[PDB]
Amino acid sequence: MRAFSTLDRENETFVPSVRVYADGETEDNSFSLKYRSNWTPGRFNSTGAKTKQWHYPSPYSRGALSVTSIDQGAYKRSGSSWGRPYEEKAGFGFSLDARSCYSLFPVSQNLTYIEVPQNVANRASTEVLQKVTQGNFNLGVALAEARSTASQLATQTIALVKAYTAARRGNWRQALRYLALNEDRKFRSKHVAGRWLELQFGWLPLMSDIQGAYEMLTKVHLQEFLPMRAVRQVGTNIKLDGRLSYPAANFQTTCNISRRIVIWFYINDARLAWLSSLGILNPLGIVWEKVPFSFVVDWLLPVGNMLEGLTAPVGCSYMSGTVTDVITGESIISVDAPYGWTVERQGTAKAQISAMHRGVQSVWPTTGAYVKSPFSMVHTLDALALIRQRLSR
Amino acid sequence: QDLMASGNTTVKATFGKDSSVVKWVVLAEVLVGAVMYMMTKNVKFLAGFAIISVFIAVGMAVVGL
Amino acid sequence: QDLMASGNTTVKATFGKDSSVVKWVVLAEVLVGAVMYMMTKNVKFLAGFAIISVFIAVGMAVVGL
Amino acid sequence: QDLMASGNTTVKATFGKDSSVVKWVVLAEVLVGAVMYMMTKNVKFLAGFAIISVFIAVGMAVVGL
Amino acid sequence: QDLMASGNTTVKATFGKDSSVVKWVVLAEVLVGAVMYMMTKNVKFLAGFAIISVFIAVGMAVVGL
Amino acid sequence: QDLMASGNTTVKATFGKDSSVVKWVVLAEVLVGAVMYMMTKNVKFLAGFAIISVFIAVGMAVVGL
Amino acid sequence: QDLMASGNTTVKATFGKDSSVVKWVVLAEVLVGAVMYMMTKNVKFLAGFAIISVFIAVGMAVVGL
Amino acid sequence: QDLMASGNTTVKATFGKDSSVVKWVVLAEVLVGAVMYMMTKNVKFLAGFAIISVFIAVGMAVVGL
Amino acid sequence: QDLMASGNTTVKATFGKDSSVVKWVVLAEVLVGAVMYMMTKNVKFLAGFAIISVFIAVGMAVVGL
Ligand SMILES: CCOP(=O)(O)OC[C@H](O)CO
Ligand SMILES: CCOP(=O)(O)OC[C@H](O)CO
Ligand SMILES: CCOP(=O)(O)OC[C@H](O)CO
Ligand SMILES: CCOP(=O)(O)OC[C@H](O)CO
Ligand SMILES: CCOP(=O)(O)OC[C@H](O)CO
Ligand SMILES: CCOP(=O)(O)OC[C@H](O)CO
Ligand SMILES: CCOP(=O)(O)OC[C@H](O)CO
Ligand SMILES: CCOP(=O)(O)OC[C@H](O)CO
């Protein structure tokens, strides 16, 4: 878009126318132318449906046909024749009307429909789909609070999985720094099951923090609306000749037709409802005395399944996309021348154009498209390498 | 509640002064007024070269949305 | 008791002067009036450029809620 | 939304100046004016030698895209 | 209410003195009154070189908006 | 409890704008309007080339889920 | 779920521009227009040799899948 | 799948240039044209001896399979 | 397949040069041209004694099977 005026004014030029021458012377014257200097059509103000989840867009268009000088141338121258014246211145002047300077452009009178070539609309649709499936979009309002509380689960597992494997090897000096403790405390037991029962309070607050965020994802975050926005502007230059227207013147003229396809969609899948109805055990209601040491691996069954589900591509469903149609260019006549014348410064004429229109229909394949989840954070991918190499393999 | 017959401004951009209606009504006169010199051959169908822009102006700016 | 056919003010905002009915009845004349120069080509369909605002006033201001 | 009556530039290239309509309306004068010397035989139908290019320049210049 | 047939000042600028009607009614006499010397050849059609400015003044200044 | 007649978004994707209903209602006009020139042969069934996109917009955008 | 009325691209290849519908509508005018010279014999049915390609373009390019 | 309205090339060889349609439309003019000298007896229906090959060329060569 | 409108050579032997059509068109002029000396009594209807063999040759030799 550029600067353009809407006030309809007229100018009188003498010939311153132328111257013348024749021578010286021358013257013448111248023328114134117223003649008319510019023209502006009527203001088209439309509305749309307003629900309780997302506001539907409304059609809107303006456009302006401004003409400059006449360148115126011277033529014438011368021559014448017648014668014366023538011367141268441148115326013979021969003025032109501003309401008929769009003959050199493929634009209708309403300044809305723009004839797009086959080598422009086809390339604009492939560059958007290649970024959604591969993972290249912008986050939304609900995606900010969803990914903030979801990354805290995989982060706390770093100090828990690495500390669980250290007990089976015989290196107790590494598990003290991960459990927020001190290395200036000796142990009393000698067995592998008695050393873990000594520092029981060192992992009690870490257990309540897992259920504090897991119950809010499978019951609140997975039962709302997650909007996503994709921005991709495509603009090419078209030079035509004409044867023438017115015147014759043749116116010889130039124009730049731009298009920014914005498609709004949300996450919609049938297999995501199975992970939202699963439960989790409570460490406060289970006595850790009779339970043996081999229980941490069996407890990570509902937690480990969530880390592997947030990395697989999940399909999405579109709603109503907007196709912007903005054209920019000039036309020099160378116116034528015438015749013769011468121276141258020779009688010339310069005219400008600036239209804007947003489409209603969207482009989306009916056969589905695997969209990568935005939960592919660096801190979340480190938890998968600690399970399939030590806790499973 | 409000009304539901409008809210889109679709018929305004289709049937109006700045639409395609003024282009289909200007060729209908020359299609028959310029070929009636065979039977009639007179000066009669010459008053329609100025009433096109006048009738479309007083019939469109009646309400104005 | 009172009546139950009204009390919503829905038909008044839909079928009235300040609605969308006045726009669909103002362009229906030029749709067949500016294109009939091919068959008849006469000055006859010109009495409709004044009866639009008259017929809408002698029917809407009859009751007026 | 936008309109659907135009956007193709098809009727403009058919009924215009740089088309084929100007070639069919120019031979209609000599087809009936140069043969009516049998009944009338008077210089009367000779005013059409210059009004052909004028009538096409006053109607097409109204819009002209 | 008021009237709806005017309020645009469009027909006054088209069919008036400071328009284009005065130019099309001044060359129609020389088109035939200056070439009819072949059949008639008599000084008769000379009273029209003064009634042009008189007929346009006794008809336009009747109402005057 | 809640309702059980919906919760699937199946009828919305079948009878809507971005479905297949808009493609079957657009070819029915040219199938019978472009072949009735044998008996009628007149300009009458030409006011339907703009009401197709209007009728689909004044009915689908009423509720909108 | 999705829709089930389409997904085959069958009606598009049958009722379209690159099919057989454009051939059955181009020879229907000459079947009745070139034979009515026995009773009427007038220059009237000549505006149909240009509206064939226009009507097929303003109806097929409405949705376009 | 494909289309089923064609694939036989039957209507093309029946209603075309190299068929029998060009013969039934060339004798219909002289059937009423050379016998209307009873009541009328005027040079009128004479411009149709050249529009036969012109109308068939702008009607058959439109698509051409 | 082939065409079914011909294959009999029936209309060619009935409406042609070597048939009976050339006889019914040569006596229609003397039926009204030789008796109009009562009211008119002028030398005007004499241009038809040569256009009979010309009009029958410029229409029959167009296709020629
Ligand atoms: C070319 C259009 O002709 P029309 O004005 O429809 O003809 C009507 C009468 O049958 C003869 O004027
Ligand atoms: C010049 C006005 O004419 P009208 O009175 O509208 O109609 C009379 C006849 O019906 C002409 O056809
Ligand atoms: C001898 C001349 O014959 P024509 O020129 O056919 O007729 C003359 C006028 O038509 C008289 O009215
Ligand atoms: C003399 C030039 O032609 P016009 O002025 O059309 O003639 C009128 C009368 O018919 C004279 O005979
Ligand atoms: C056609 C009339 O003959 P011209 O010699 O052209 O003019 C002479 C006068 O008109 C007297 O008739
Ligand atoms: C010049 C104006 O007068 P005219 O039209 O010549 O009429 C007078 C007599 O009829 C002589 O013919
Ligand atoms: C274009 C549709 O309007 P027309 O049918 O041409 O005219 C209206 C009346 O039916 C006069 O016949
Ligand atoms: C003269 C060429 O034929 P047309 O124009 O059909 O003739 C009509 C009247 O006979 C003219 O007076």
UniProtKB/Swiss-Prot annotation, chain A:
Main localization, broad class: virion
Single annotated GO MF: RNA binding
Keywords: Host-virus interaction, RNA-binding, Viral attachment to host cell, Viral attachment to host cell pilus, Viral genome circularization, Viral penetration into host cytoplasm, Virion, Virus entry into host cell
Subcellular location: Virion
Annotated stretches, region: Viral RNA-binding: 26-233
Domain of life per record: Viruses
GO biological process: viral genome circularization; virion attachment to host cell pilus
A Gene Ontology term for the protein's cellular component: virion component
Modification comment: During internalization, MP is proteolytically cleaved into two fragments allowing translation and replication to start.
SUBUNIT field: Interacts with the host pilus.
Biological role: The maturation protein is required for the typical attachment of the phage to the side of the bacterial F-pili. Binds to sequences located toward each end of the genome, hence circularizing it. The RNA genome-maturation protein A complex is released from the capsid upon host receptor binding. Maturation protein A enters the cell along with the viral RNA.
Stated family: Belongs to the Leviviricetes maturation protein family.
Annotated protein name in UniProt: Maturation protein A
Organism lineage: Viruses, Riboviria, Orthornavirae, Lenarviricota, Leviviricetes
